[PDB]
Design an enzyme around this catalytic site. Structure first.
Site, PDB file in Angstrom:
ATOM      1  N   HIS A 168      38.087 -18.168   3.450  1.00  0.00           N
ATOM      2  CA  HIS A 168      36.857 -18.780   3.947  1.00  0.00           C
ATOM      3  C   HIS A 168      37.221 -19.674   5.128  1.00  0.00           C
ATOM      4  O   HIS A 168      37.040 -19.298   6.291  1.00  0.00           O
ATOM      5  CB  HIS A 168      36.203 -19.566   2.800  1.00  0.00           C
ATOM      6  CG  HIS A 168      34.857 -20.152   3.103  1.00  0.00           C
ATOM      7  ND1 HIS A 168      34.359 -20.305   4.378  1.00  0.00           N
ATOM      8  CD2 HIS A 168      33.924 -20.676   2.272  1.00  0.00           C
ATOM      9  CE1 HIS A 168      33.167 -20.876   4.317  1.00  0.00           C
ATOM     10  NE2 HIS A 168      32.879 -21.108   3.050  1.00  0.00           N
ATOM     11  N   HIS A 183       8.159  -3.126  -0.060  1.00  0.00           N
ATOM     12  CA  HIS A 183       7.166  -2.623   0.872  1.00  0.00           C
ATOM     13  C   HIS A 183       7.703  -2.397   2.283  1.00  0.00           C
ATOM     14  O   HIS A 183       7.862  -3.347   3.059  1.00  0.00           O
ATOM     15  CB  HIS A 183       5.952  -3.553   0.930  1.00  0.00           C
ATOM     16  CG  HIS A 183       4.887  -3.070   1.861  1.00  0.00           C
ATOM     17  ND1 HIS A 183       4.254  -1.857   1.698  1.00  0.00           N
ATOM     18  CD2 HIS A 183       4.361  -3.624   2.978  1.00  0.00           C
ATOM     19  CE1 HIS A 183       3.373  -1.690   2.667  1.00  0.00           C
ATOM     20  NE2 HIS A 183       3.418  -2.747   3.458  1.00  0.00           N
ATOM     21  N   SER A 229       0.806  -1.219   0.000  1.00  0.00           N
ATOM     22  CA  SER A 229       0.000   0.000   0.000  1.00  0.00           C
ATOM     23  C   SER A 229       0.841   1.272   0.000  1.00  0.00           C
ATOM     24  O   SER A 229       0.456   2.251  -0.640  1.00  0.00           O
ATOM     25  CB  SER A 229      -1.013   0.012   1.139  1.00  0.00           C
ATOM     26  OG  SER A 229      -0.360  -0.088   2.379  1.00  0.00           O
TER      27      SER A 229
HETATM   28  C1  LIG Z   1      30.332 -25.074   4.895  1.00  0.00           C
HETATM   29  O1  LIG Z   1      29.079 -24.471   4.735  1.00  0.00           O
HETATM   30  P1  LIG Z   1      28.898 -22.866   5.091  1.00  0.00           P
HETATM   31  O2  LIG Z   1      30.381 -22.140   5.168  1.00  0.00           O
HETATM   32  O3  LIG Z   1      28.191 -22.706   6.355  1.00  0.00           O
HETATM   33  C2  LIG Z   1      27.843 -22.047   3.780  1.00  0.00           C
HETATM   34  O4  LIG Z   1      27.624 -20.754   4.300  1.00  0.00           O
HETATM   35  C3  LIG Z   1      28.626 -21.884   2.459  1.00  0.00           C
HETATM   36  C4  LIG Z   1      28.486 -20.555   1.658  1.00  0.00           C
HETATM   37  C5  LIG Z   1      29.253 -20.369   0.346  1.00  0.00           C
HETATM   38  C6  LIG Z   1      30.164 -21.509  -0.186  1.00  0.00           C
HETATM   39  C7  LIG Z   1      30.302 -22.829   0.601  1.00  0.00           C
HETATM   40  C8  LIG Z   1      29.530 -23.016   1.927  1.00  0.00           C
HETATM   41  C9  LIG Z   1      26.492 -22.770   3.467  1.00  0.00           C
HETATM   42  S1  LIG Z   1      26.522 -24.273   2.485  1.00  0.00           S
HETATM   43  C10 LIG Z   1      25.207 -25.042   3.104  1.00  0.00           C
HETATM   44  C11 LIG Z   1      24.622 -26.321   2.533  1.00  0.00           C
HETATM   45  C12 LIG Z   1      23.831 -26.039   1.257  1.00  0.00           C
HETATM   46  O5  LIG Z   1      23.350 -27.307   0.909  1.00  0.00           O
HETATM   47  P2  LIG Z   1      23.114 -27.681  -0.656  1.00  0.00           P
HETATM   48  O6  LIG Z   1      22.185 -29.010  -0.685  1.00  0.00           O
HETATM   49  O7  LIG Z   1      22.542 -26.566  -1.403  1.00  0.00           O
HETATM   50  O8  LIG Z   1      24.556 -27.972  -1.348  1.00  0.00           O
HETATM   51  P3  LIG Z   1      25.669 -29.088  -0.918  1.00  0.00           P
HETATM   52  O9  LIG Z   1      26.479 -28.517   0.167  1.00  0.00           O
HETATM   53  O10 LIG Z   1      24.904 -30.478  -0.512  1.00  0.00           O
HETATM   54  O11 LIG Z   1      26.538 -29.276  -2.293  1.00  0.00           O
HETATM   55  C13 LIG Z   1      24.509 -24.142   4.170  1.00  0.00           C
HETATM   56  C14 LIG Z   1      23.139 -24.422   4.796  1.00  0.00           C
HETATM   57  N1  LIG Z   1      25.394 -22.914   4.524  1.00  0.00           N
HETATM   58  C15 LIG Z   1      25.071 -21.997   5.605  1.00  0.00           C
HETATM   59  C16 LIG Z   1      24.007 -20.974   5.195  1.00  0.00           C
HETATM   60  C17 LIG Z   1      22.670 -20.966   5.875  1.00  0.00           C
HETATM   61  N2  LIG Z   1      21.682 -19.969   5.492  1.00  0.00           N
HETATM   62  C18 LIG Z   1      21.993 -18.945   4.410  1.00  0.00           C
HETATM   63  C19 LIG Z   1      20.986 -17.890   3.989  1.00  0.00           C
HETATM   64  N3  LIG Z   1      23.322 -18.943   3.749  1.00  0.00           N
HETATM   65  C20 LIG Z   1      24.306 -19.928   4.139  1.00  0.00           C
HETATM   66  N4  LIG Z   1      25.568 -19.880   3.466  1.00  0.00           N
HETATM   67  C1  LIG Z   2      -3.461  -3.103   1.515  1.00  0.00           C
HETATM   68  O1  LIG Z   2      -2.368  -3.978   1.512  1.00  0.00           O
HETATM   69  P1  LIG Z   2      -1.005  -3.579   2.358  1.00  0.00           P
HETATM   70  O2  LIG Z   2      -1.349  -2.375   3.437  1.00  0.00           O
HETATM   71  O3  LIG Z   2       0.048  -3.153   1.445  1.00  0.00           O
HETATM   72  C2  LIG Z   2      -0.357  -5.088   3.255  1.00  0.00           C
HETATM   73  O4  LIG Z   2       0.882  -4.654   3.771  1.00  0.00           O
HETATM   74  C3  LIG Z   2      -1.255  -5.446   4.459  1.00  0.00           C
HETATM   75  C4  LIG Z   2      -0.585  -5.878   5.798  1.00  0.00           C
HETATM   76  C5  LIG Z   2      -1.454  -6.237   7.006  1.00  0.00           C
HETATM   77  C6  LIG Z   2      -3.003  -6.175   6.891  1.00  0.00           C
HETATM   78  C7  LIG Z   2      -3.670  -5.754   5.567  1.00  0.00           C
HETATM   79  C8  LIG Z   2      -2.793  -5.388   4.347  1.00  0.00           C
HETATM   80  C9  LIG Z   2      -0.187  -6.366   2.369  1.00  0.00           C
HETATM   81  S1  LIG Z   2      -1.651  -7.291   1.895  1.00  0.00           S
HETATM   82  C10 LIG Z   2      -1.147  -7.898   0.452  1.00  0.00           C
HETATM   83  C11 LIG Z   2      -1.922  -8.923  -0.358  1.00  0.00           C
HETATM   84  C12 LIG Z   2      -1.787 -10.317   0.252  1.00  0.00           C
HETATM   85  O5  LIG Z   2      -2.522 -11.110  -0.636  1.00  0.00           O
HETATM   86  P2  LIG Z   2      -3.290 -12.436  -0.090  1.00  0.00           P
HETATM   87  O6  LIG Z   2      -3.671 -13.326  -1.391  1.00  0.00           O
HETATM   88  O7  LIG Z   2      -2.490 -13.165   0.888  1.00  0.00           O
HETATM   89  O8  LIG Z   2      -4.632 -11.975   0.704  1.00  0.00           O
HETATM   90  P3  LIG Z   2      -5.883 -11.095   0.132  1.00  0.00           P
HETATM   91  O9  LIG Z   2      -5.519  -9.675   0.241  1.00  0.00           O
HETATM   92  O10 LIG Z   2      -6.224 -11.577  -1.395  1.00  0.00           O
HETATM   93  O11 LIG Z   2      -7.098 -11.491   1.157  1.00  0.00           O
HETATM   94  C13 LIG Z   2       0.330  -7.478   0.177  1.00  0.00           C
HETATM   95  C14 LIG Z   2       1.207  -8.034  -0.950  1.00  0.00           C
HETATM   96  N1  LIG Z   2       0.802  -6.407   1.201  1.00  0.00           N
HETATM   97  C15 LIG Z   2       2.075  -5.715   1.084  1.00  0.00           C
HETATM   98  C16 LIG Z   2       3.242  -6.563   1.600  1.00  0.00           C
HETATM   99  C17 LIG Z   2       4.321  -7.008   0.657  1.00  0.00           C
HETATM  100  N2  LIG Z   2       5.437  -7.789   1.169  1.00  0.00           N
HETATM  101  C18 LIG Z   2       5.512  -8.158   2.644  1.00  0.00           C
HETATM  102  C19 LIG Z   2       6.663  -8.970   3.211  1.00  0.00           C
HETATM  103  N3  LIG Z   2       4.452  -7.704   3.579  1.00  0.00           N
HETATM  104  C20 LIG Z   2       3.351  -6.918   3.069  1.00  0.00           C
HETATM  105  N4  LIG Z   2       2.358  -6.510   4.016  1.00  0.00           N
END
Ligand SMILES: COP(=O)(O)[C@@](O)(c1ccccc1)c1sc(CCOP(=O)(O)OP(=O)(O)O)c(C)[n+]1Cc1cnc(C)nc1N
Ligand SMILES: COP(=O)(O)[C@@](O)(c1ccccc1)c1sc(CCOP(=O)(O)OP(=O)(O)O)c(C)[n+]1Cc1cnc(C)nc1N
Ligand SMILES: COP(=O)(O)[C@@](O)(c1ccccc1)c1sc(CCOP(=O)(O)OP(=O)(O)O)c(C)[n+]1Cc1cnc(C)nc1N
Ligand SMILES: [Ca+2]
Ligand SMILES: [Ca+2]
Ligand SMILES: [Ca+2]
Lengths: 524, 524, 524
Positions: free
Chosen positions: B280, B69, B25
């Site tokens: 790393h 948003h 919104s």
């Molecule tokens: C040894 O692993 P790490 O050094 O911890 C890891 O960070 C990493 C990042 C870049 C290159 C290599 C490893 C990665 S690798 C890893 C496993 C991903 O599993 P995936 O099945 O995709 O591939 P593989 O390892 O089996 O080939 C995770 C969960 N993490 C930690 C992590 C958690 N949540 C988020 C948003 N980002 C992350 N990087």
């Molecule tokens: C009028 O809508 P808004 O005031 O913009 C909204 O923020 C909102 C939040 C709480 C109560 C009512 C509306 C909501 S409601 C809304 C639609 C969700 O669609 P959904 O299909 O889940 O339900 P409905 O509206 O069809 O019943 C979105 C995308 N947004 C913006 C938004 C985007 N990305 C994330 C992470 N959070 C958010 N709140």
């Protein structure tokens, strides 16, 4: 080796030999066994410490190193850091932290959330995660302060770190050379040069980064080749051009409408080493008038981003000014005619007009004098009346923060022992960092301080006048005896109630072997 | 003109024509009357929005514009911003704020302390003080994202600002050209060139900013002239060099000791467009061995400052690589010999070795394919087995943040419609931004997604192995049907349980007219 | 003892026995030798991890402990933290940092400026200066999360800290009891009670902190004694009152004018456990009408400060509600009459009206069901149609951040194994945290997910309608098969295209032994 020994070795290998400081317990383990090749400059309050270091860095064109006490010492210096940010001053600010074992409990003198304290006034702010990291963090601080755009940085160090063993691999830090001495690529530089060559009525505007780069002489050559008038960008922290050169047109008024009017009829305006622009007063209008286009060369991405008009090139000012000066054609246009001499203001045998003071300074001061200005209501007159032929001849609080000139004049004088520094400071401004006087006395740094005493915050009375603001409190500062303050801190003191006394006082001050303060009775 | 009209005009005049977004919104007054010359790309979650925009910006070598948003939308994108920061991705992130009249009471959807929310992952973060300031703030955002070192920026805009009158003086923003295309001054560049010419055994290390600058071909010329081996800096976000060129030596292991050992005997090591270094694993040792000196060319002061060794030059990578390639002497040393082809791993008729998958991709994919890697345990093998001849052929999460490759592969494919994008993503990694698949289906962006399914977080099992860590929870991810997930979001889905099925699936995918997901059963 | 052993002992002694997490290498030294008395709950993306933990904490009325991976993991969770901030959820968020020896060089996975990353969405954010400080920092995190006003906190821990020796003096942390269970002093409480007793037409407004405190029954007693109508404060994150109690008047519209109109004629309005007020839509008018005065009891100084009207008392909601309920006089006024039953909306044999869905849920669900709402366009109808007799029966994203209800419903179900959780989630909202479904399948947490599928972001279409906004992109989300998504993550899936199928699907879901997703075709 210890972290202490390794850090001092890094500092000396990177050209640092002076510590500007006000000490405390968190800093004692750093300051103990102070190396015999280093110098410590004490000041009595941290705004003064940083102001002195700032003047020193700006005049020396190299980083200055500062040591403050935890949060309270850092905090006392934050007004000074605001100026340093605006002047791109390469300041390495270190502050002592509590011992790591006592940080959690927030013992007295713990700097809480330390890296956040000086923000947003620093380029980089940090506390290392371990003692062995300290030399590397110091290396980062040195280079962050020193790379374009230069600026202050902050490093917090727990006091127990200094005695710990350093990482032997820290030796790789000692001789690192880091360069930002860069200029626009050949192809695009050729385009710029052709635009300057083709301009029918170019103008040049110069800011403080020209003087910081010692690009002044190159800018003179550039202006002479282009046969172009030269202005100093508004709210000028430094003087980037000889003020009696035929091309010089003075300090720009710090207003939007005023500047576009001044630039009207100039087809290409080249700005070098300035923000576009450091306006001050409300003066709404056109940023540029039709027919004017602007090109800015700046060392600072933040300046290029925020300019409301014009093209920009982010590069080193020294490298760019040299390249442009040597590449542009010699225009066949006539060289601009020098501005005429200022008028003499009528002066009776009573209180001094500021114009009289500046004329007399110009008459009596050496040709290589360095001036500082914190006489806020008299800036336009100062710029018109002082012949400043050489680089590094003028400093003014870059963020408008009072309390700069008095300590900075001491740092500048330390940086330039053979050039007489003369700080012209209003009676209001003199108080902010009054204790800095003591450092001049103690180290016998022979700065001359000229206090313009009119009993009021003059610039504020003027701004209130234009606002039509009635019943504003706090504008008057009566009842300050500046000779007594000077005596308090051990500085020779003179008084000038009229022109005869002003000349006599200046003659004595210029002949003196130490710092001198002259209290001048100026017109209200 | 309105702020709305003026802002869209600024965007189009600065080359922006696409908005990557998830709406709300606070953004409706910005998105209404959406210009007919602009495109909106919807994604279902903000990590996906930003990942898509990031891939698009990196591949297009130009800024991408994002609309999220308020705080919750921005917050959902912060993992994605961590990658963008490390890859120097020029992303303009805008987020809608509550109407100014409702900010004080902290109405629902107020982004509290908005400019602080995305820090420290942005170059600049701001909320304007008035509606009329919005176009100027947008101008700042565009240029801050675009100037070297490029990076993400953040702008928060109260929703009532869009309908307000714009300042007529905002027209000066439209055509501003801002350049950071700079290189080291002639004198110091000559010194560098002479050092390279004089080296007896030079080595070259290249990072992602080479590929971002399209400096790849210049680096090939440089390596050929110097007859120098070329490595890719560790934790590589991009591929900066043809991987079958005779000089190529592959991806450096991300360890201190490993890298100094690799560089032993090389007298001068020239690093271009990389941090020094993105280590790393813990691998303590010497940063460099005796006899090796390092010179870094980087676009980023923060990289130059933190390098624990070597000299550095902060400049544009494109400009520097071109200058060096064209200035260095042709060495009379023998050109390095090409690395031999990788071995074929024994493969039975069951589950696929990752090596088999990469060999098969290399066999079947077009020569101008673009790969993305989020198969974290197989990176070394991927780098050895894919012949990547062209620039812009490889992307890997620059901060190691999973959830990048799936959406980024869609943005890359949008940027490069004539180059087949193939994202190789582990079964663990695939989930982080799984909903991005929908955007590929909806806009018919024909990315191929190869899911390496071994049922576990493989890289974590390996790191746990080296730590000798027993009883670690949460390492297994059984029970995910990726074909069903693909069906859920409208993407054609195939399964490959063996080599015969892998070849068949790839043949079908490469022939398809839309996006395709292949679930590959890989060895545990 | 090690830091590892000491920290887990502190956690267990402070009542923590579950870690909600998504693991990484920086966390492996924390997670290794995972204690046998602890449970680890894996989720596939960090918004899901935090959402699950949030639902668990809110329903259990105790802190929940989270472990995320460095900056990228933390960043992925920041939308979820925005909700947690608004709901005062006591969440202890820990994130692994690089080893201290590799922080300086900014190795991959270094969380740069870590404590700043989650701001402004946390009460306290910290990285300890040494390994031995870790248990003390954890103690601070536990208590900061738990003290009124409760909220999320953040602790970053370098991975090498865990194996280091703990300080033996850390034992003093284990059994610390910290109370904020406070109420207004007797004298001023007597003044408040007399004002309530003397009111001629009092009204009561209740917010989420009532339900968090389990102050619901005390508020019932208070309303009965005062014979006062009871409203729920707007944008309600929780349900603080039995919705069929005679005093109940429903959810307040989130508008300034709407609320002052509703309160007109009420002389004293007592608000308990809510901000004043969480308005949403622009609805300008009077904050209160003449004749109404407001008194707010809040656990949060930030709420008391920002209320635009009324008096405030900052105190514990449980303690204040109990004191008021037991001190006020029994009014001789008539008890308010119960609101009449909602109307039945006409329903054909086709797609479902949301009203039909809520009526059917009310008919079929157990009396102790717990509902979650992320069906943004149907909230008013939901509140009217569900009889919620018991505390802890309703949750809605407190900052409006979508992606809350799906994971939170899993955490709530984990907290309340004997109460059937039913999450009603729009087709748009379902995607934000879709991967959370996997956690329900893996741990067999029998949450029911009801997906309201109308193919569009309905609430946005409505807000666009009132703005009269034409040509808004990105409002439609066609082409999502939620049964296939459920299958993808191992959750039993059903579809309801009409009322007959809805009843059949609910009967099956309520009888099932695991989680179930029902995709409901709802009217556009
Ligand atoms: C040894 O692993 P790490 O050094 O911890 C890891 O960070 C990493 C990042 C870049 C290159 C290599 C490893 C990665 S690798 C890893 C496993 C991903 O599993 P995936 O099945 O995709 O591939 P593989 O390892 O089996 O080939 C995770 C969960 N993490 C930690 C992590 C958690 N949540 C988020 C948003 N980002 C992350 N990087
Ligand atoms: C009028 O809508 P808004 O005031 O913009 C909204 O923020 C909102 C939040 C709480 C109560 C009512 C509306 C909501 S409601 C809304 C639609 C969700 O669609 P959904 O299909 O889940 O339900 P409905 O509206 O069809 O019943 C979105 C995308 N947004 C913006 C938004 C985007 N990305 C994330 C992470 N959070 C958010 N709140
Ligand atoms: C042992 O001394 P410390 O622990 O360092 C010190 O911080 C301190 C503070 C409170 C109580 C006791 C000592 C104090 S005490 C101290 C000396 C003050 O000298 P003063 O002549 O006033 O009194 P005395 O010590 O001779 O009786 C200094 C300079 N510092 C460090 C300091 C520097 N700059 C600023 C703005 N605040 C500070 N506290
Ligand atoms: Ca004065
Ligand atoms: Ca895997
Ligand atoms: Ca919907």
């Amino acid at each position: 080796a210890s972290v202490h020994g390794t850090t001092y070795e890094l500092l000396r290998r990177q050209g640092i030999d002076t510590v500007f400081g006000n000490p405390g317990s968190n800093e004692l383990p750093f300051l103990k066994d102070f190396p015999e090749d280093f110098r410590y400059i004490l000041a009595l309050q941290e705004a003064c410490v940083v102001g002195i270091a700032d003047g020193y860095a700006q005049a020396s064109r190299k980083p200055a190193f500062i040591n403050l006490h935890s949060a309270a010492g850092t905090g006392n210096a934050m007004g000074a850091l605001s100026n340093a940010w605006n002047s791109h001053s390469p300041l390495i600010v270190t502050a002592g932290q509590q011992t790591r074992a006592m940080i959690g409990v927030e013992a007295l003198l713990t700097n809480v959330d330390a890296a956040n304290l000086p923000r947003p006034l620093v380029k980089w702010s940090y506390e290392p995660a371990s003692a062995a990291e300290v030399p590397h963090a110091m290396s980062r601080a040195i280079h962050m302060a020193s790379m374009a755009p230069q600026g202050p940085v902050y490093l917090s160090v727990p006091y127990d770190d200094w005695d710990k063993d350093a990482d032997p691999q820290s030796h790789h830090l000692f001789d690192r050379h880091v360069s930002s001495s860069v200029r626009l690529n050949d192809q695009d530089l050729d385009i710029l040069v052709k635009a300057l060559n083709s301009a029918s009525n170019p103008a040049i505007v110069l800011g403080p980064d020209v003087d910081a780069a010692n690009a002044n002489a190159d800018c003179v050559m550039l202006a002479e080749r282009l046969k172009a008038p030269v202005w100093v960008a508004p709210s000028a922290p430094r003087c980037p051009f000889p003020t009696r050169h035929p091309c010089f047109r003075g300090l720009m008024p710090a207003g939007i409408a005023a500047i576009s009017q001044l630039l009207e009829g100039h087809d290409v305006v080249l700005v070098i080493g300035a923000p576009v622009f450091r306006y001050h007063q409300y003066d709404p209008g056109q940023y540029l008038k039709p027919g004017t286009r602007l090109i800015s060369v700046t060392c600072d991405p933040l300046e290029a981003a925020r300019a409301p008009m014009g093209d920009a090139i982010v590069a080193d000012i020294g490298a760019m000014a040299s390249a442009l000066a040597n590449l542009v054609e010699e225009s066949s246009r006539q060289l601009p005619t020098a501005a005429p001499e200022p008028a003499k203001v009528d002066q009776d045998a009573g209180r001094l007009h500021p114009e009289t003071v500046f004329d007399t300074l110009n008459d009596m001061a050496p040709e290589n004098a360095i001036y500082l200005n914190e006489s806020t209501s008299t800036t336009a007159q100062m710029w018109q009346r002082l012949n400043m032929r050489n680089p590094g001849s003028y400093y003014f609080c870059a963020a408008g923060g009072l309390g700069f000139a008095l300590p900075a004049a001491i740092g500048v004088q330390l940086a330039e022992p053979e050039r007489q520094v003369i700080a012209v400071i209003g009676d209001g401004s003199a108080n902010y960092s009054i204790s800095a006087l003591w450092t001049a006395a103690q180290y016998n740094i022979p700065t001359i301080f000229v206090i313009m005493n009119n009993g009021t915050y003059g610039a504020l009375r003027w701004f209130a006048g234009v606002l039509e603001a009635e019943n504003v409190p706090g504008l008057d500062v009566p009842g300050i005896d500046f000779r007594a303050l000077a005596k308090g801190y051990g500085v020779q003191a003179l008084k000038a109630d009229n022109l005869e006394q002003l000349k006599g006082s200046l003659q004595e001050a210029l002949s003196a072997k130490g710092p001198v303060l002259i209290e001048v009775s100026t017109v209200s």
